Amino acid sequence: ANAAIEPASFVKVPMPEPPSSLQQLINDWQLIKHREGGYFKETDRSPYTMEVEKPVMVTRNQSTLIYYLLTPDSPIGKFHKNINRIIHILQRGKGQYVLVYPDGQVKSFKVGFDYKNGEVSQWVVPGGVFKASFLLPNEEFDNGFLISEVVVPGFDFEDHTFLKGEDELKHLVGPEKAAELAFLAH
Amino acid sequence: NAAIEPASFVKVPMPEPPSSLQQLINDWQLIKHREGGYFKETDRSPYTMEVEKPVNTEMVTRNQSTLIYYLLTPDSPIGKFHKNINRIIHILQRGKGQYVLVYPDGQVKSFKVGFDYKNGEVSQWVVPGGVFKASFLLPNEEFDNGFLISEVVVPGFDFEDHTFLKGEDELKHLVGPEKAAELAFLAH
Ligand SMILES: Nc1nc2[nH]cnc2c(=O)[nH]1
Ligand SMILES: Nc1nc2[nH]cnc2c(=O)[nH]1
């Protein structure tokens, strides 16, 4: 279900520190800051490999799994895309995703366990589609947003592409839309 | 390694699920699985891959991945022993539960699933291929005694790669005859 893009106060202006409960989670699990924002850790990378044809044959692990957490101090996952589709599974909290297709269409939906209100707890972002995400205030998980992501073939930086500023965003969605989504781009 | 201490509704399931879970089941179209529990395949990758499988082996085509929601309830609190050639990624979403893994070696491992990682619980777990796995519901008022997870199989799930255990008979041959008596409620 479509969702209005109405970033909360701490999303537009990140807080210097996250609630102690989330900091503890970060420390105990040894999560590290992701280049696109948020905290993460690869917890699984298949022992099995596969060969795939890539536009310029390469080898990749069959799959990779990560924990990905957004917090009040790092509430945004900046726009980026992967050649491969990515499976997302909600575990704790609430968040919102914004997708920008190559043709320019923008889609946004909310993630949470209240499906009766349009929220989803499983979602796949097709390869080639730019995605960004931001934290939604929620009391159930101390204003945090924890999910698991699985990519097949397994993650490789060579298949990753981050969006470059509002300039590149402008080419895709136009000036007005680019301005509205600027807070989600590098 | 948690101890196998089944709740009352596990050894003797309730006739029907509680209203909150029945509503979830109906809204999501979850169907009772043969091995027990309710499930639904929500994604099967349109992309494929060729993999070698023993039969002497031969090449077969598989979808790159499959995803399902899997739910245990008081009326169906057990996910009976079954195995797959492929490893399976499990992601906890709601509730609590416990797994029992029987490796081909005969080794038995058991652990609890939940978000209290401070108490040994885990919210992500990968079961290697060839390992028989079973799960049972753990009481928890948080999710009205439900246990919801997501499972991702890579390569994607295919019946040709699936194997369910047949009663204590085969179970007894894998683990001690005495152990088969303790895990008997998770098989057949
Ligand atoms: N799996 C994985 N490893 C990474 N290392 C750096 N960035 C990433 C990422 O997005 N995924
Ligand atoms: N992924 C998946 N799809 C199925 N289709 C029928 N049964 C199953 C099953 O157990 N898993």
Question: What SS3 class is residue A181?
Answer: coil
Whether residue B124 lies within 8 A of chain A, CB to CB, comes out as yes
Around Cβ A62, how many Cβ atoms within 10 Å?
21
CA of residue A156 to ligand 2 center, whole Å: 29
Partners of A122 on chain B (C-beta within 8 Å) are 42-43, 67, 69, 150
Burial of A89 (0-12, 13-18, 19+ CB in 10 A): buried
**Are A63 and B154 a contacting pair at CB < 8 A?**
yes
Q: A94, A99, A90: which is closest to A127 by C-alpha?
A: A99
Q: Whose CA is nearest to atom 6 of ligand 2?
A: B41
**Mutational test site, ligand 2, from B31, B39, B42, max ligand atoms within 8 Å of CB:** B39
Atom of ligand 1 lying closest to residue A66 CA = 1
Nearest to B93 among A44, A67, A91 (CB): A91
- Whether ligand 2 lies within 6 angstroms of the CB of B160 is answered as no
* Cα separation values, B57 from B37, B53, B153, Å: 33, 5, 21
The number of folded domains in chain A is 1
Q: Angle at CA A150, nearest 5°, toward A149 and A154?
A: 130
CA of residue B160 to ligand 2 center, whole Å: 11
Cα–Cα dist A11/A183, whole Å = 9
DSSP annotation of A64 reads E
- Whether ligand 2 lies within 6 angstroms of the CB of B86 is answered as no
Pairing mode, strands A130-135 and A76-82: antiparallel
DSSP annotation of A35 reads T
Whether residue A58 lies within 8 A of chain B, CB to CB, comes out as no
Q: Residue B40: CB partners within 8 Å, gap ≥ 6?
A: B28, B29, B30, B31, B68, B69
Q: What is the CA radius of gyration of chain A?
A: 16
Q: A169, A152, A134, A159: which is closest to A3 by C-alpha?
A: A134
Complete DSSP assignment for chain B: -------HHHHS--SS--HHHHHHHHHHT-EE-TTSSEEEEEEE-S-EEEEEEE--EEEEEEES-EEEEEEEBTTB-EEEEEEESS-EEEEEEEE-EEEEEE-TTS-EEEEEESS-GGGT-BSEEEE-TT-EEEEEE---GGGTS-EEEEEEESSPP-GGGEEE--HHHHHHHHS-TTHHHHSGGG--
**Are B89 and A63 a contacting pair at CB < 8 A?**
yes
Cα–Cα dist A45/A149, whole Å = 12
CA neighbours within 13 Å on the CB side: how many for A75?
26
Q: Residue B63 in contact with residue B156, Cβ under 8 Å? A: yes
CATH of the domain at B4: 2.60.120.10
**Are A122 and B42 a contacting pair at CB < 8 A?**
yes
Cα–Cα dist A23/A150, whole Å = 24
Around Cβ B147, how many Cβ atoms within 10 Å?
27
Q: Angle at CA B106, nearest 5°, toward B103 and B110?
A: 60
Q: A24 φ, ψ to 5°?
A: -65, -40
* Length of chain B measured in residues: 188
Q: B16 φ, ψ to 5°?
A: -140, 160
- Whether ligand 2 lies within 6 angstroms of the CB of B63 is answered as no
Around Cβ B144, how many Cβ atoms within 10 Å?
16
Q: Could you tell me the sign of the dihedral formed by the alpha carbons of A153, A155, A157, A160, in that order?
A: positive
DSSP annotation of A120 reads B
* Cα separation values, B105 from A17, A122, B131, B132, Å: 48, 35, 9, 11
Torsion of CA A34, B42, B76, B107, to 10 degrees: -60
Q: B45 φ, ψ to 5°?
A: -55, 135
**Look-up of token digits 């097709």:** A126
DSSP annotation of A29 reads H
Nearest to A65 among B42, B115, B124 (CB): B124
Q: A173, A157, A8: which is closest to A95 by C-alpha?
A: A8
Q: B125, B167, B161, B85: which is closest to B2 by C-alpha?
A: B125
Q: Which two tokens stand for residue B33?
A: 């699985």
Nearest to B93 among A67, A89, A153 (CB): A89
Cα–Cα dist B178/B188, whole Å = 16
Question: What SS3 class is residue A182?
Answer: helix
Q: How was this structure determined?
A: X-ray
Question: What SS3 class is residue A68?
Answer: strand
Cα–Cα dist B121/B103, whole Å = 21
Q: Residue B56 in contact with residue B31, Cβ under 8 Å? A: no
Question: What SS3 class is residue A55?
Answer: coil
Domain that includes residue B120, residue range: 1-188
Q: If phi over 0 gives left and psi between -120 and 50 gives alpha, with beta otherwise, what is residue A131?
A: beta
Residues with CB under 6 A from ligand 1: A 34, 42, 64, 66, 155
* Cα separation values, B46 from A66, B137, B155, Å: 22, 33, 12
* Cα separation values, B74 from B17, B26, B79, B97, B133, Å: 6, 16, 12, 12, 19
